[PDB]
Design a protein around this ligand. Structure first.
Ligand SMILES: C=C(C)[C@H]1CN[C@H](C(=O)O)[C@H]1CC(=O)O
Ligand SMILES: C=C(C)[C@H]1CN[C@H](C(=O)O)[C@H]1CC(=O)O
Ligand SMILES: [Zn+2]
Ligand SMILES: [Zn+2]
Lengths: 258, 258
């Protein structure tokens, strides 16, 4: 009866509240995706419990074992009913779970320390004084691994052999590396996280140039679930009421520190 | 066996070629959605025929008869297998047909003649010297009709009573009215058409301000169709190959006249 909603810690989508150790159940979390889960549950009329995904991953298939990890895996193996997180809509995931229409749009983008002489991906690809990298797993890394576009193929060729490794484990690590590189590191990450960080102190990063692609985050359910259709319609309803726009403003811009 | 693909004339999505009267079948049309139909058909492996929708409408339900008109109606009543056009993904349509993930993103936007002193929707709502309106039917008009947001409610209140009528029948009429108003008419229309027109001679219009909402166009199929899943995956595949970006550039920007 109580619906299991898998998600993952990532600012400002899902975060522990400051006093979370005094709170219980859903009340210990806050963020965009926390607010979105509450609005979807009200429209679909369900009771639910937020569960943080055990392995801390989003979702990819191990090439050797064929096992799906992360939140995707939770849905595929029947351990969760719905995933609500910044889970990028990609063909390999859509083949195994269902995604709602997108609740947020985004693209891969470039984050630099203010003053770095880079304005585009082409600017990065042409040189190597300024190192650049992606998270060590995820949709952005796969974008580069799989691209057949000249400039991105060149970038992937550089990133896979660069030493020391240009890959980072978490968004916070990628950000700290831009901040502590003295302008010699640029981080390639989703425009949404890039936009959020650009409004946080110390106000020393910025998003530069256009995005390299155009995609969306979606709410995900197992294939065949009776919740899929109602969740999808709930997302469109919230879009048309202006609620997704209000939530983005609330968590990115209303209390922007810059 | 041959798949019926319903669509509609709208530049630069679907247009007759200059010598179309000497050509037959699919070869008489060209445009973004013509190229998109060809790429989807190749991936899904189907033979198809493009049919221009008889009533020249996109899709809405008559409040008296309950009958669906336009391309949506063609799908619902079984007269077409797929619709490929700038058909906006909206909750009322998604309740009755299936949409693919979005192949293009867009929002309602404002088109002005160069020099008009308007930079936002708030600027329009505050005054009446510069008249403003939408197409007489479609998603944009319904956006305003249904909005509960203060500024848009005020705009809808003005538009519904304004005399002479601020509504127009077609994009071309709305555009001609901006061009022939001497700066006293602004047209509210989807950002995609706004962007296209801004690159056509005489180069005297522009898109101003941000978009008022954020949505997408989708390829549509009847509910239950065996083509729905393969079409959806085809759209994601083309997105990830960069083909949707290439097609947008081809039809909007590569031969831009401005
Ligand atoms: C935060 C992470 C690791 C996630 C979020 N969206 C992508 C995903 O759904 O794969 C990942 C980021 C990216 O790959 O840059
Ligand atoms: C061209 C037209 C009348 C269509 C295209 N997209 C919207 C639709 O799918 O309703 C309409 C435009 C708009 O309402 O501004
Ligand atoms: Zn704790
Ligand atoms: Zn003819």
């Amino acid at each position: 009866r109580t619906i299991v909603v898998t998600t993952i810690l990532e600012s400002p989508y899902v975060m522990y509240k400051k006093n979370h150790e005094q709170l219980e159940g859903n009340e210990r979390y806050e963020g965009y995706c926390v607010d979105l889960a509450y609005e979807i549950a009200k429209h679909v009329r369900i009771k639910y419990k937020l569960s943080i995904v055990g392995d801390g991953k989003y979702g990819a298939r191990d090439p050797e074992t064929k096992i799906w990890n992360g939140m995707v895996g939770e849905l595929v193996y029947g351990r969760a009913d719905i995933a609500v997180a910044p889970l990028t809509i990609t063909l390999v995931r859509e083949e195994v779970i269902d995604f709602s229409k997108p609740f947020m749009s985004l693209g891969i983008s470039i984050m630099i320390k203010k003053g770095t002489p880079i304005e585009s991906a082409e600017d990065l690809a042409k040189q190597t004084e300024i190192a650049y990298g992606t998270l060590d797993s995820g949709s952005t890394k796969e974008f580069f691994r799989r691209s057949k576009i000249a400039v991105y193929e060149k970038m992937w060729s550089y990133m896979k052999s660069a030493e020391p490794s240009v890959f980072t484990k978490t968004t916070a690590d990628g950000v700290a590396r831009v901040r502590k590189s003295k302008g010699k590191f640029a981080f390639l990450l989703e425009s949404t996280m890039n936009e959020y960080i650009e409004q946080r102190k110390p106000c020393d990063t910025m998003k530069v140039g256009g995005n390299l692609d155009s995609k969306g985050y979606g709410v995900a359910t197992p294939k065949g679930s009776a919740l899929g259709t109602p969740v999808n319609l709930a997302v469109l309803k919230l879009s048309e009421q202006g609620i997704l726009d209000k939530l983005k403003n609330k968590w990115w811009y209303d209390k922007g520190e810059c």
